[PDB]
Design a protein around this ligand. Structure first.
Ligand SMILES: Nc1nc2c(ncn2[C@@H]2O[C@@H]3COP(=O)(O)O[C@H]4[C@@H](O)[C@H](n5cnc6c(=O)[nH]c(N)nc65)O[C@@H]4COP(=O)(O)O[C@H]3[C@H]2O)c(=O)[nH]1
Ligand SMILES: Nc1nc2c(ncn2[C@@H]2O[C@@H]3COP(=O)(O)O[C@H]4[C@@H](O)[C@H](n5cnc6c(=O)[nH]c(N)nc65)O[C@@H]4COP(=O)(O)O[C@H]3[C@H]2O)c(=O)[nH]1
Ligand SMILES: [Mn+2]
Ligand SMILES: [Mn+2]
Ligand SMILES: [Mn+2]
Lengths: 332, 333
């Protein structure tokens, strides 16, 4: 429906410009990069000239692995340009496309954004702040990702110049990342888009390769997990020893990983973050609402994803406050 | 369409028999069960009479978790019958459908098969020497992900008044997940089309996660093999269990497997006390390093990516040593 008209409607909004320039959000992830690459391709399909804005300093380790493939094995590189090159090349008929974000403060380059007279916003979140006077707004909160939304727009244009395998892989990876391998916000349309991409060469094992965790993170993550106590009621608590500082990501990951073990519906992981700060990551399948649990300990978030931080306490005191909160939350 | 043709042809063959009996392979997995279920929904969509064969001895831990949900929908629970119930109700007009196998000695009940007059076969394996005798229809597709994927396609072309239920599509979806290791093996656009169809009918991802939860204890175990690894610069990794401890062959195989999922690892070698006298080596590789050669050269063997060996007498630290030496060997040309 929307996806039907908006596709053709925007090859027109794009047909009316010298070039098209694409920007994601700062610290681009694979949804951002894949969505941009898609749109890149969507424009090329109408022989429109397209470039994606990326600076050396935006490219993190995960993205770095991607870009190495992009240099070693295609000609995808040459469509990536710096902020400067973007500015020094855009007129006022140049269409800027914003993918995977809607707040201007978050756009990869607010200057390249502000300069452009013709703005379009493709994002899959819900709407305060927002881009000024956009020629079009494709906001669809129920998609899994921006890469999904762009995938189903590709399916209307000149079938001629097809998605490369590699472009497909990266779009695919963005979907994998945002859905956690098809376990979150996945609808039939996610699978429709995954079908389309896989039809065009999307490599699942290369996708695995971009995403692989490292040894030390596994080891550190499992240190927390081997301490878990699971209650009959499905609540599970793991912890780090009070004398050891854990990186807050491996704590978040531990909490996630536990949701994949039998009998665990909600996970809480407690570990020293700083010299006088304890962190707790909470996670659930949706039966237990871990937002309430974190809010009652000074944190917050969403029903299945939440966290909090506590100062001055030892690991054991925070666990105590944690149990107090849980037993209070699930008294019946 | 081919599947449209097959769908419609199967409708005739099922309707002209007097009822349908559905049977997968021995120690059925979620795919065989998902597939059988889909076939029984297919039948119902044409007010045919369908039964799935399943004995209580034929239900592993995973499957029991699944039957636990099925018991809540009597309509669905009542479709499953035992080998006996099945034999005593077969006639000459009864049509038996084999799912997820094509090998007569792999069928769940050889007896029920042998009494079968009218037969159908749907599988995603490739033909071996043996084969179901004189089937009325054959829907094999060696490149598909699962029999659940194939059955799913056939479903798409039938009356939709009494649709595939939420619970039915969930089990079929689970079969696809097990067979493809969560869309990481032998997955194709058609696999995603099946998945989309299933998901459109309420296939529940959380419940599927439930069916497939790992054992806490076994996570921790596999964890302390992986915890031990040392990865050389060339991407060869070596993990070991203590020699005083003893590990399940599956814990070991899983550790070696799960090491490949880590960054910068081309090949894994896990080594742990397999008995009291014996030591075990599991070896895996992305596809580059030649774990076969390494293992063959230790009185073992397997395949380029998946090989292994056992060594009786030695103790781990020396088994590790024999590994280093054999590796150092094929490595330096
Ligand atoms: N009201 C309130 N809410 C809070 C507070 N602290 C955290 N939250 C909220 O609760 C969410 C829980 O994630 P986290 O456990 O703190 O843990 C962090 C972080 O450790 C985790 N994370 C970061 N990178 C990764 C990753 O590569 N993988 C995984 N599995 N998790 C990651 O996700 C979280 C960060 O993302 P967020 O979207 O911000 O998601 C946060 C955030 O929305 C707080 O003091 N007050
Ligand atoms: N020449 C020679 N070849 C050998 C020897 N041992 C194994 N092989 C061959 O190479 C494969 C290596 O797997 P494994 O590490 O020994 O590990 C074992 C076993 O631990 C593992 N396994 C057992 N259960 C499971 C399971 O539920 N899941 C998974 N992923 N693996 C399992 O699969 C392997 C056994 O099944 P196979 O299909 O036969 O797979 C074997 C077998 O084909 C040997 O001593 N000499
Ligand atoms: Mn993003
Ligand atoms: Mn996104
Ligand atoms: Mn199968």
């Amino acid at each position: 429906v929307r996806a039907r008209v908006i596709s053709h409607a925007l090859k027109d909004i794009l047909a009316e410009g010298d070039k098209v320039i694409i920007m994601g959000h700062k610290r681009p992830d694979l949804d951002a990069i894949g969505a941009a690459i898609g749109v890149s391709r969507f424009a090329m399909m109408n022989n429109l000239e397209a470039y994606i804005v990326l600076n050396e300093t935006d490219i993190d380790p995960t993205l770095r692995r991607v870009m190495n493939e992009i240099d070693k094995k295609p000609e995808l590189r040459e469509r990536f340009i710096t902020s400067d090159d973007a500015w020094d090349m855009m007129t006022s008929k140049t269409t800027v496309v914003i993918v995977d974000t809607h707040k201007p403060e978050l756009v990869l380059d607010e200057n390249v954004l502000n300069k452009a007279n013709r703005k379009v916003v493709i994002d899959h979140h819900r709407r305060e702040s927002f881009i000024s006077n956009p020629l079009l707004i494709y906001m669809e909160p129920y998609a899994s990702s921006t890469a999904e939304l762009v995938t189903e727009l590709l399916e209307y244009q000149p079938t001629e110049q097809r998605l490369t395998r590699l472009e497909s892989t990266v779009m695919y990876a963005g979907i994998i990342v945002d859905t956690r391998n098809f376990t979150l916000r996945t609808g039939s349309r996610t699978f429709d888009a995954a079908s389309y991409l896989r039809a065009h060469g999307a490599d699942t094992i290369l996708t695995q390769h971009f995403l692989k965790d490292d040894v030390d993170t596994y080891i550190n993550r499992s240190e927390l997990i081997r301490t878990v106590k699971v209650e009959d009621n499905g609540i599970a608590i793991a912890h780090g020893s009070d004398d050891k500082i854990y990186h807050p990501v491996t704590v978040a990951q531990a909490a996630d990983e536990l949701l994949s073990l039998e009998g665990i519906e909600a996970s809480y992981v407690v570990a020293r973050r700083e010299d006088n700060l304890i962190g707790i990551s909470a996670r659930s399948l949706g039966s237990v609402n871990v937002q309430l649990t974190m809010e009652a300990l000074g944190g917050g978030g969403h029903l299945t994803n939440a966290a909090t931080q506590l100062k001055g306490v030892t690991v054991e005191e925070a666990i105590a406050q944690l149990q107090q909160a849980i037993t209070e939350q699930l008294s019946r």
